[PDB]
Amino acid sequence: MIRTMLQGKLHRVKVTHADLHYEGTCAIDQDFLDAAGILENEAIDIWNVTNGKRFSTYAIAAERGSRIISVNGAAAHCASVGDIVIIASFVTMPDEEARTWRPNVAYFEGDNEMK
Template structure:
C-alpha cells in the first residue's frame, strides 16, 4: 500500500513577484529548489498565509541566489507581492520506505535566504496567547 506523505516544504517564503501574463506557474530560486529536493516542472502545493488560499501549480527555476518567488499565470490571482507562502510537495511511500521516512523542511528569512533545514516539525507551543479560546456564551446560559 502506498501512502501520500509530505516530501518537503519551503516554509514562509515571501512572494517577490506576481505575474498574471507570464507563462509558467511558480518560479522559485534554484537554491531553494535544490535544498527542498524539488525538480523543475514538479507539481507543488502553495498555501498563502495572508489570505488562506491553497492552490496547486508546478515549479520552474528562478536564478540561483536571487530569492525570487514569482507566482505566475492564473496562480497570480492567488498571491501578490509580499504575501507569505508555504510551498509543499508530496510523494507516495510504501511501508518499507516509511521506516526511514523524514521530510525535508526548509526555513527562510524575509529575503528568502535559507536559515536552516529540519526533518521534523517542532511541537506546537500550546501556551501561546490566543491558542485556547472559550466559546461565546449566549444570553440564556450566562
C-alpha cells in the same frame, strides 16, 4: 499499501513577483528547490499564509541566488507580491518506507534568507 508523504517544504517564503498577463509559469530560486528536494516540473502545493488560499501548480527554477518566488499565470489570482507562502511537494512510497521517511524542510526569514 502506498502512502503519500511530504517530500519537502519551503517554510514562509515571500512572493517576489506575481504577473498574470506576461508570465505564466511559477519560478523558484534553484537553491531553494535544491534545499527542499523539489524538482523543476514537479507538482507543488502553495499555501498562502497571508490570505489563506491553497492551490496546486508546478514550478521551474529561477536563477540561483535570486531569492525569487514568482507566482504567475492563473496563479497570480492567488498570491500577491509580499504574501508569505509555504510551498510543499509530496511523493509516494510503500508503507514500510513511509514509516521512517524524513521530509526536506527549509526555513526562511526576511527577504527569503534561508536559515
